[PDB]
Amino acid sequence: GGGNHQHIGKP
Amino acid sequence: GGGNHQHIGKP
Amino acid sequence: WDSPLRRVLAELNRIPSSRRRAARLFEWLIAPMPPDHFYRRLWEREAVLVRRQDHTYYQGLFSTADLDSMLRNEEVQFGQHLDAARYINGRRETLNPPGRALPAAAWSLYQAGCSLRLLCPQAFSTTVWQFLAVLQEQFGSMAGSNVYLTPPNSQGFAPHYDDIEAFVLQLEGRKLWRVYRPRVPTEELALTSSPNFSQDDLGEPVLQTVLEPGDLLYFPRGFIHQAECQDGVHSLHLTLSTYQRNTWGDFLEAILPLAVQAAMEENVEFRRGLPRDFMDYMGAQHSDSKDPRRTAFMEKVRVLVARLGHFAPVDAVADQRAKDFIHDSLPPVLTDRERALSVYGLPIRWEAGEPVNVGAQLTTETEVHMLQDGIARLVGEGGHLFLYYTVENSRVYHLEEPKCLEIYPQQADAMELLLGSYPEFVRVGDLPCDSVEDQLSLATTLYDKGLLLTKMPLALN
């Protein structure tokens, strides 16, 4: 499992 | 026209 | 049917300047804390909790009902738009099935203990769009957001720090938050997001609280945080993020190659040959040499590097970042007046077999000013002049390529005036161009693009 806040709104 | 000294030995 | 958020939006719609609207919204966002105090003392320095004592403060911004509609009525995909996340045995998991995120799949994942995170709320909600579009203008940096919906008695995400400045807006429910100071000098104002951490990696929280709707929690990039739902309620929150890679070092990174190149072109000391034999005393293998040429080689590096300050094209780099910002920006949200005074509000439409209201033109007597203050930047590139603008940007980050138009040298002065004097009206006829042709064509080109407004509508019903 991976990612936290994605500011740009994409993966 | 064209090129002068070719230090590298190459074009 | 009314709320503080609904009222502030109506209030913004009556504030004629976009710069002022932005300041006012950010004041509202952190109220009652003064922005000036916040920016001087807390921004990039401390975690900050604002206990609102008002569960309704954000009503109208985003709700779980909104999310449920969007899953039904929009083409929301797992991965691209929505994540399903769990944090369970010290382990972060991701449970996204590939494809469409229908209600039926999303809610069963929720029911099984998965948090749902919407990556681009602003693409689906006009209120979140307006929110971010207004706020970006006082950040000088893209404002993004994610929405995090977490089910009862669960944690969705591992403790971590992110690479942005974060404002958590508690929307519904309750959540227990733990926020930690940077663990080490190197983590203070981190450049990149951290890995998921374990509890053994954590120190003592500097802030531990149960957020409730209306509350705000802010913390700088590098502050570890984690969150949980207890006591059988869910949580929904929106995290507003900004200032991704907007540091002094990122400014330098762009400045330096240009400065060196300029230094080499303009000063022979930067063009002189290296020593023929520097490889005898420089290099890893020579790291302990007592050759004084080593000493001098180092000094020279530092003296030359120091002198680069003089060759740094600071304004040029400022304009390239401005231009990047223009590209990253959400497109603007127009007040009713702005709409009514611009190309967007022209009453021209099709009725009974024909277009009505054709043709009301700009003249030298038309008084104008830029549509808003944060939609355009004039940038010189390749000895040409280009006006970059936001008014055709998508609500999705970089979905459209950068938009611009060329401004001819004859028209440059008039354009600079326009941008530098918002929101003061100027007669087209008093714009600094030689002719009446150039006056009229700049103004008209700006108008038709949706960059300009008129003191009165050009066309009436």
Place this chain on the structure above:
Amino acid sequence: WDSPLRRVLAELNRIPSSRRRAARLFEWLIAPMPPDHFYRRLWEREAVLVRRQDHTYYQGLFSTADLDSMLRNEEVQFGQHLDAARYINGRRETLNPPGRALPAAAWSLYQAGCSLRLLCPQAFSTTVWQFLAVLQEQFGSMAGSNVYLTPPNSQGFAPHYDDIEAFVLQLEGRKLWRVYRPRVPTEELALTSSPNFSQDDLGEPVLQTVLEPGDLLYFPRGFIHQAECQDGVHSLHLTLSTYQRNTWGDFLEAILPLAVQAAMEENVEFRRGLPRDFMDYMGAQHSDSKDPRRTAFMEKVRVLVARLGHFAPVDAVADQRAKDFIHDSLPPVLTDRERALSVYGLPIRWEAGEPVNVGAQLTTETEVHMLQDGIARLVGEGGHLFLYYTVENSRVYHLEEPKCLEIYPQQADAMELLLGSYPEFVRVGDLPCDSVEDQLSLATTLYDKGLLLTKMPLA
């Protein structure tokens, strides 16, 4: 048959150190001027003429006959290896027909008044090779050459400046030269070659001389020059070039991105956010603003920029340049003794149905040193240790990829020694390694690659 060049070469062959061979050759090249004077006062500063008073000085280096055999016996191609050039009525022309440059085509172009320029003499001539291979080692920069053959009563090339330091070796015939100081501050030590110029673009020559065989003319990059053959004799000359893009600035170019990256990793002032509103007072549009935030923003940039000197990985950039120089280098020219003491001189051959003389192996008692002093460089990359070397380079620039081998940590100290103590012999057994397995394998690996010699032939 004996000439000063042939004698200095036979002399080099008796000088055990490659570093000394290189210094000695450069001394010969500019004799009787002292190298130290030349480097301190003339290099990168002044045009220099050396009137040799000895037409035979360069005999054996390269001749027009050598060129004639080359055209006949090697696959010399127009464009790739050989240009035909004219300068008449102020216009530079290039007249290369596509394909093979046979004698028949080259000589009728010569006859019709074209200069012939060979771009890589060293690929086709073992003497020019040696000449450049030795000299590169005291320049610390690639030594290139072109050969220029110009027919009587013609000029081959427009006035221009080049991007290198140039040494013109007059070989046969005579040529009238004009060399000019840089015309303006920005032309002094120019970064790139100029366009072909016209005579209305020129000032007054600082040096105007008829060169004769044996003479030398040196001038810095940025110095305009041009040359003509008069009277009735042709000209041949070899121009030795060096110091392409080897400036303080080129060093900084590579230093700076690393320095900022390190400053950002290790110091929070470089990680602090920009002002939210700097776009209000910075940019072209604000070039005249009196906002004191503007003056503070400039000052901070100059202070942060200054502080980067502290974070600059100077040795790592030194080693990257060393690595690039290793890649650019011509392969080494071995003395008879070096050959004989190395893998190259092992007498193992095929004799009547079989290999004869398998040599000894090396042992702890074998005394060793690097084959030469300028063939190898140890460079750290990605927490790995890589020995880059020149011994398998082509005589053609970058025809082969960069050649390297990995040195394990166990073996790094012993490799460092080897490279820092040339030419002193070291017993393999005394090499700083944990084991005698590491001692033996570093030496053996180095030897088989042609990187190491032995005090006595292994056979």
